[PDB]
């Protein structure tokens, strides 16, 4: 027979490969569509979640009951040290897809970036990019590099920049830097390639990529929770206490005539550690890191024009389970996916 009292299903059918993410760093599944009229600019950045705190501000939405009134918002701090550009890569559109055409790495590569290419750093001899750097110190190598750049300029449609985070400037234990391809959106392919080549072996701060009062997207892996039952994974109704063979379980799985279990049935399995892309996160404040002229300048982090104090975003005793934030940071409205110390990908909005 039919279901007596209709009720919406539990969970989302569009989000249920419920497996631990193969990747740990958030992947940009779709970059913003590049308009060949705006100047060249990087469309993404890589930060690390530090913690959350309060923010107090006056809102300016006319007609609301809370207009011109003090409100408090939860804000998440993402420490975002400037990233070092170490390579560029071209992509050519093909009827089968978007095939990578040519990848060109820089001459000098930091040990933080070199650590990623080795599973074991202590055991290895650190021989990565040993003969490749010879191309930048020979006439034949320089000619080959020029020919590769010319080929990328002629043929490639999409150009991305390989940039790696600076793990030295972070309180995190690990030293293996995270590399990432960031698609460059801007003018013509030639100008874009020239800008990318100029930015080689250079630092990129967060002010270049993002600005204040901007809506962005945060991509990251959910804080894992291990094996979980259906009552926690899909938030199904709990069976009554009188049940014999358990109560935190799905009671009826499926009907008789289809002699198979449907993929839409809520089953017990992995919960957490899922790749997610939250959208419409507002940048409340891009705060400058610690800088020294004569002494330490920590006021720029948390001091405002109405507070005019000497406080930094670091609370008393530092952030819990993360460390102390000394570099440039971005403060986002609301919460973001992932636990502490977790690497997050900040992407420009894909919508008008």
């Amino acid at each position: 027979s039919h279901r007596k009292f209709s009720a919406p299903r539990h969970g989302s059918l569009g989000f249920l490969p419920r497996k631990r993410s193969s990747r740990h760093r958030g992947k940009v599944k779709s970059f913003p569509k590049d308009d060949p009229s705006k100047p060249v600019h990087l469309t993404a950045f890589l930060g690390y979640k530090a913690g959350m705190t309060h923010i107090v501000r006056e809102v300016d939405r006319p007609g609301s009951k809370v207009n011109k009134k003090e409100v408090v918002e939860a804000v998440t701090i993402v420490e975002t040290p400037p990233m070092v550009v170490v390579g560029i890569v071209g992509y050519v559109e093909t009827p089968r897809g978007l095939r990578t055409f040519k990848t060109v790495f820089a001459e000098h590569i930091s040990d933080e970036c070199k650590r990623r290419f080795y599973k074991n750093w202590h055991k290895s001899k650190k021989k990565a990019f040993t003969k490749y750097c010879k191309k930048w110190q020979d006439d034949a190598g320089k000619r080959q590099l020029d020919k590769d750049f010319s080929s990328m300029k002629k043929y490639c449609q999409v150009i991305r920049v390989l940039a790696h985070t600076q793990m030295r400037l972070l309180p995190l234990r690990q030293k293996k830097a995270h590399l990432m391809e960031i698609q460059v959106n801007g003018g013509t392919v030639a100008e874009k390639l020239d800008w990318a080549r100029e930015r080689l072996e250079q630092q990129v701060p967060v002010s270049q990529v993002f600005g204040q009062d901007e809506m962005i997207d945060v991509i990251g892996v959910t804080k894992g929770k291990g094996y979980k039952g259906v009552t926690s994974r899909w938030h199904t109704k709990k069976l009554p206490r009188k049940t014999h063979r358990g109560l935190r379980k799905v009671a009826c799985i499926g009907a008789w005539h289809p002699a198979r279990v449907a993929f839409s049935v809520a089953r017990a399995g992995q919960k957490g550690y899922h790749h997610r892309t939250e959208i419409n996160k507002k940048i409340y404040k891009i705060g400058q890191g610690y800088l020294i002229k004569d002494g330490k300048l920590i006021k720029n982090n948390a001091s405002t024009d109405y507070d005019l104090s000497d406080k930094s975003i670091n609370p008393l005793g530092g952030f819990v389970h993360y460390g102390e934030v000394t570099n440039d940071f971005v403060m986002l409205k609301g919460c973001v996916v992932g636990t502490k110390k977790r690497v997050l990908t900040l992407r420009k909005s894909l919508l008008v």
Partner: protein, 199 residues
């Protein structure tokens, strides 16, 4: 030793039956420009048929269900597989022999391609009837790379136009040379045309 066919202007099943029969006999067949294939009947009817094919799906686990390929080349491959006994080793070998490409790749862009008059639209279909392009059907059913294929095909058309101009100039030069040199090869063209040549 390998057949090269231009999918443009050919009817879907009419060409698929011939290709399957040829590939059963060990003949290697390559079909290009599968977006140029056109199916009889109105476009709305063909789209509704393909939407019904999409609706055919495994209820309990669609991952095991029918694989509805959206690319025109894969659609033609699947319609040939439907005429081939793919369950058997001979059918699998025929499928391996068959090759299908979206547009026309550089491996075959510089090769002359045959045309089957037994499957052509102008030959098998009345001019008063309607037909639907496989490229249009694929694009409206889920294909992604219509515009890229179109741009690459336009570039190839320009290059082939240049090549044809060069070849036509070469043929004109050959005609001029033959006209200028026929006096000393009169005894050869004469014996050529006595047996039914150059006439």
């Amino acid at each position: 030793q390998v057949l090269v066919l231009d999918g443009r202007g050919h009817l879907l099943g009419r060409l698929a039956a011939i290709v399957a029969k040829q590939v059963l006999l060990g003949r290697k067949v390559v079909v290009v420009r599968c977006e140029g294939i056109n199916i009889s009947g109105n476009f709305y009817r063909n789209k509704l048929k393909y939407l019904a094919f999409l609706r055919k799906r495994m209820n309990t686990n669609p991952s095991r269900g029918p694989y509805h390929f959206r690319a025109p080349s894969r659609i033609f491959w699947r319609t040939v597989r439907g005429m081939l006994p793919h369950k058997t080793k001979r059918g699998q070998a025929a499928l391996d022999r068959l090759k299908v490409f979206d547009g026309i790749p550089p491996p075959y862009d510089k090769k002359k391609r045959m045309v089957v008059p037994a499957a052509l639209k102008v030959v098998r279909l009345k001019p008063t009837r309607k037909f639907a392009y496989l490229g249009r059907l694929a694009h409206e059913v889920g294909w992604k790379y219509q515009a890229v294929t179109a741009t690459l095909e336009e570039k190839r058309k320009e290059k082939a136009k240049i090549h044809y101009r060069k070849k036509k100039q070469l043929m004109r030069l050959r005609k001029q040379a033959e006209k200028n040199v026929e006096k000393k090869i009169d005894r050869f063209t004469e014996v050529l045309k006595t047996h039914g040549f150059l006439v």
